[PDB]
């Protein structure tokens, strides 16, 4: 069971290149003061939830008195239910009525009756809440509203932000950016040198290895993942698949998966294009759609079939053969036929045609067929 004990997908443990950087943004967690004005904002999969498990797992165990429970910004949707879920501290009788109006009714609850104690909540996936109200109206309004740090008594009620992928970071406004609270610190957490990260996950071991993964294949895996944004959860589902395709024989085999899932999504632009088409009637029609693009952008299948009897007019053929042979070009993954608005003059639905790949390699695909050269 040494192959099953190689679990790389969900595990107990930036621990890769920024260990001093994560261990120097946890300052005032024992002095009962305000620590850091940081905003964790990075690519989706770098390890923000990973560091923010350990940063509280240091301060969970025998509790100076700290009571802290983590929740998420999931069942909110609208800016309506932010404050009720964090109110399971002393399970009070109040909470529904007095609290959800105003900041001074939560400033009423910032002073601690039961000693200084501690209660710092970490609202998780906080960019998911602020993506409503369509300009700023009650979500970006709430983000410029709940980052006020105005009165600072002896009260431990800080809240670090858990922002998601860089979808709407670079969109700002002067209310969000002018000296109120926890703004001016944001860090990209991209795990470069993830080879050493995998070495830490395997050396933190409970199942002794004999033949380790080859670091040439490990560095090839770390090369062929971090070009897009550098997702680590994406790379964690690659070596697991490599040892899963190793078990299908009952670095030499941890490569054909990426050389398998890159080629599978890619397939062949022109080599398999005609190969799969093998049929000429499944070949020249793609040229008919190519000629039905530089005259009209509302390429109806009729327009793909009025182009058909403006090319072959030199055993009959009905429209059903054309629209079912187009399903082959649908099945392979080139063409899109669905109902759209059909702007035109009247606005009722009809079929469309669209193509995806750029006309560079397909123009080299016709260099072997002598009948698809005059149609270009």
């Amino acid at each position: 069971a040494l192959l099953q004990k190689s679990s790389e997908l969900v595990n107990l443990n930036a621990r890769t290149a920024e260990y001093e950087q994560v261990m120097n943004f946890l300052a005032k967690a024992i002095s009962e003061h305000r620590s850091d004005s940081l905003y964790i904002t990075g690519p989706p999969g770098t390890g923000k939830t990973a560091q923010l498990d350990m940063i509280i797992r240091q301060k969970f165990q025998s509790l100076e008195s700290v009571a802290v429970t983590s929740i998420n910004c999931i069942s909110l949707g609208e800016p309506s239910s932010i404050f009720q879920k964090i109110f399971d501290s002393f399970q009070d009788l109040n909470g529904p009525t007095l609290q959800i109006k105003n900041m001074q009714h939560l400033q009423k609850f910032l002073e601690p009756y039961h000693k200084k104690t501690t209660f710092v909540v970490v609202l998780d996936e906080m960019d998911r809440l602020l993506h409503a109200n369509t300009s700023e109206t009650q979500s970006v309004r709430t983000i410029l509203e709940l980052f006020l740090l105005a009165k600072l008594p002896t009260v431990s009620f800080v809240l670090i932000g858990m922002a998601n992928s860089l979808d709407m970071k670079d969109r700002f406004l002067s209310r969000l950016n002018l000296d109120r609270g926890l703004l001016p610190q944001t860090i990209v957490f991209q795990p470069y040198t993830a080879e050493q990260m995998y070495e830490i996950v395997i050396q933190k071991m409970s199942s002794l290895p004999t033949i380790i993964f080859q670091p040439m294949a490990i560095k090839f895996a770390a090369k062929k993942c971090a070009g897009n944004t550098g997702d680590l959860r994406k790379l964690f589902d690659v070596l697991r698949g490599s040892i899963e395709i190793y078990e299908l024989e009952k670095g030499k085999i941890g490569l054909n998966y990426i050389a398998k899932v890159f080629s599978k999504f890619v397939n062949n632009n022109s080599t398999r294009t005609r190969i799969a088409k093998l049929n000429i009637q499944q070949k020249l029609i793609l040229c008919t759609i190519i000629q039905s693009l530089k005259l009209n952008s509302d390429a109806t299948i009729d327009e793909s079939f009025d182009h058909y009897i403006k090319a072959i007019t030199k055993a009959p053929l009905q429209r059903n053969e054309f629209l079912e042979i187009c399903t082959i070009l649908e099945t392979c993954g080139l063409v899109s036929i669905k109902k759209t608005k059909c702007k035109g003059k009247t606005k009722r639905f009809v079929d469309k045609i669209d193509v995806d790949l750029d006309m560079r390699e397909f123009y080299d695909e016709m260099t072997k067929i002598s009948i698809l050269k005059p149609f270009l």
């Binding site: 069971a1 099953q4 004990k5 679990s7 997908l9 969900v10 595990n11 107990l12 989706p44 999969g45 998420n72 999931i74 069942s75 949707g77 399971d88 399970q91 998911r128 998601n164 992928s165 979808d167 997702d231 959860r233 994406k234 964690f236 589902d237 690659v238 698949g241 899963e244 395709i245 078990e247 299908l248 899932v261 599978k264 999504f265 009729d302 079939f305 009025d306 058909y308 009897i309 009905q318 429209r319 059903n320 053969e321 079912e324 042979i325 399903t327 082959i328 649908e330 099945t331 993954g333 035109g344 003059k345 009247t346 009722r348 009809v350």
Partner: protein, 493 residues
Amino acid sequence: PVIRKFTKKNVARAKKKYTPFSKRFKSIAAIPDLTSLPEFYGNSSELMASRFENKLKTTQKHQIVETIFSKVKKQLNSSYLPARENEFASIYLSAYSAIESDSATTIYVAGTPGVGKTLTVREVVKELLSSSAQREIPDFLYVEINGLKMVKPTDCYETLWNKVSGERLTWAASMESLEFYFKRVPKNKKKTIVVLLDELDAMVTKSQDIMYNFFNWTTYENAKLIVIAVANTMDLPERQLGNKITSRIGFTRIMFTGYTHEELKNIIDLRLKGLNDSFFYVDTKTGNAILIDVRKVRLRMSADAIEIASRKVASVSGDARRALKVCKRAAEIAEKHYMAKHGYGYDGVQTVHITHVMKALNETLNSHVITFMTRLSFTAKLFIYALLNLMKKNGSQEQELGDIVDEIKLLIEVNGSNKFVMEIAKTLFQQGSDNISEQLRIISWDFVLNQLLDAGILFKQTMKNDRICCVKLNISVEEAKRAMNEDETLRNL
């Protein structure tokens, strides 16, 4: 008492509780063992579906009569296989390495409709239940979430928490309950559960929160769920889901490719292994065939007919359901020939061949619009002819109706020589009688507008002015050209 502004007299509310699983005990350290609980995981009162069973059974009467082709039309219904092995093995290994390792994986299958993905996934779950009965693994509670079998796309929470827990809440209480049960409850008190997300692209609604939660409960260490979500397009999280949820779904992405003609021939061979070339004891009096007056009859479901039915359906979309539909229509055609030729009626050998299955292969390759516009009325063909010859003058495909009217009047006035059109141009404008003035429109004009509007040949835009209401040919112009050339009168008119 009060006078109300409106009424809601026809309202029906369920009996569903509002407080979630987080407020049962309010003690995380004292959660009882959820596995061997009486209500949880379907351990009590599992007759909750079989209440309506003795409603659709009536009389066990009157001696139903099977025929020689009723057997094949029963074996060609919904029900090792030499079709999916490199997908079955990878899926069962990827779902077994999490059952044995208490893990939280997510498998992603996809394919165009018919490639057997839900069949192989349900057989994977049946085999894992057999392994659980053999007790080489722990057991699980199996939940199938069909994306289209629910009236609200947020009822996935309700049915999942109901299947897990035996209690039914509202959808908000169910999503908070499932969030707590998948975050905080430790892995000693929960047995694992496998979730089939059937037809995933119907729960992407307005927030992507359901797609968030079902793929973000599996990133937790403390949640033992395996999501084996199926789909209908391979690049779905690149089209309609976020890139973070693409990173959640990951890199497995095992595609169920289309079938081949050899695989489809093997499929129909296994479907008819028990019936092909066998012997039946029919009776001359009725036709009631019985497999091993009385006539011993063979049954040659011919391999050439099978492969010529299989090559076309292997080309177009490659579906192991459409192959069964073709080979069931062939048996239906055979049974109809047999019953009509013998006078049998409901209460030599028999064959299915190439020039007998070609009708089942041609029943779905016929455009019955040409044979519709030929049998159309003369005024409707004249309408279509006026629309067709306005197009060469205009070049818009969207001619007005006042133009069609004047073009019809132009054709009728410019053909004053033909005996047919001088016989018909009296009735066309005055219904063949006097005491009726010459109408501006021809008789049956709104009728032949509506008879093509409802049929989808014609396509008129909505407006109040029936001189400038535009009109488009929704089908085509080439097939209208090939349908207007067999009239013997419109070919010259």
